[PDB]
């Protein structure tokens, strides 16, 4: 077994969406989705915290998530600048629970 | 920190779909979807370039992508022989933007 540096971050992305980011070996990141999304239009900037510098990718990464108890889907864009873009459908006032694992490289 | 070999491949898989493959440590591959898929029926071979030898898996890998601005989803199969099989719904003439991160092991 080989040992590698591990960093951890929780981001309140906005609109209810919670992100749990785990970065191993300063490269591979696995994002876990939590919370519930609401009141966000398609292609719009999410209204919360931007991803901290250590977790920022060199190029854009689209991460697929899933709405719990439904067959419907969503995805988000983590931009190199730190901002998160919502690329699911237009969600109204009713919050929908959001879950999923997505991985990306930083280097 | 541990440094590892990094190989890169872009694949114009066909039907508008674009693949960006990054292979680290000659094992872990993260595929990034791009482009817009159109004119493809379910289970059909995609009409473009196959995946090059250094990036082909030993066993079939199903990768899940998402349609931007929608709650609809898709997946592709990267076969050991390098071919790419479309496994989403049938898509007509109108192109839909395709995004998502998928990972697989080669060995």
């Amino acid at each position, epitope marked *: 077994s080989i040992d590698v540096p591990v960093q951890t971050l929780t981001v309140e992305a906005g609109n209810g969406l919670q992100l749990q980011l785990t970065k191993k070996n300063n490269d591979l990141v696995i994002v876990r989705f939590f919370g519930s999304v609401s009141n966000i*239009q398609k292609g*719009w900037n999410m209204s919360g915290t931007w991803v901290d510098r250590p977790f920022r990718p060199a190029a*854009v990464q689209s991460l697929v998530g899933h709405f719990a108890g439904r067959d419907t889907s969503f995805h988000i864009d983590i*931009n*190199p600048n730190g901002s998160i*873009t*919502w690329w699911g459908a237009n969600i109204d006032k009713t919050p929908i629970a959001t879950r999923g694992n997505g991985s990306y490289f930083i280097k | 920190s541990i440094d590892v070999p990094v190989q890169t491949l872009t694949v114009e898989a066909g039907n508008g779909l674009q693949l960006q493959l990054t292979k680290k440590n000659n094992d872990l591959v993260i595929v990034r979807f791009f482009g817009s898929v159109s004119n493809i029926q379910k289970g059909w071979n995609m009409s473009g370039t196959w995946v090059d030898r250094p990036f082909r898996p030993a066993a079939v890998q199903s990768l899940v992508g998402h349609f931007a601005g929608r709650d609809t989803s898709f997946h592709i199969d990267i076969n050991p022989n390098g071919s790419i099989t479309w496994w989403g719904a049938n898509i007509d003439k109108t192109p839909i933007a395709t995004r998502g991160n998928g990972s697989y092991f080669i060995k």
Partner: nanobody, 122 residues
């Protein structure tokens, strides 16, 4: 120079007017260019925008179907074709570009044009 605005000016009722805005540099992914609408005394609002990476648009409820935004190719330019111009559409239209998607907030739009006066006569 971040942004370069052209076009605009004086126009008749129910007429048409075109607006152009090129960018010198891309700041990153989810590149978006569009226009803000500040009415005389009122609070400025995002009226129109386009994502270059995704080829998708946003329109405000008030201008839905009357206004059209498009690009060319490598030109890094967004074109705004305005039709059926009402006398309540008279404003100073500001060009704005950012990396990260559509935003209502004047916040961080890496490019912010000086603006162009648009007046509609009856």
């Amino acid at each position: 120079v971040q942004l370069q605005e052209s076009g605009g000016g004086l126009v008749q009722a129910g007429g048409s007017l075109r607006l152009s805005c090129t960018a010198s540099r891309r700041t990153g992914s989810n590149w978006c260019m569009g226009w803000f609408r500040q009415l005389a005394g009122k609070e400025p609002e995002l009226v129109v925008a386009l994502n270059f990476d995704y080829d998708m648009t946003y329109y405000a409820d008030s201008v839905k179907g009357r206004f059209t935004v498009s690009r060319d190719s490598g030109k890094n330019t967004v074109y705004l074709q305005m039709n059926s111009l009402k006398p309540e559409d008279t404003a100073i239209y500001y060009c704005a570009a950012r990396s990260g998607g559509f935003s209502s907030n004047r916040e961080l739009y890496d490019g912010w044009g000086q603006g162009t006066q648009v007046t509609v006569s009856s």
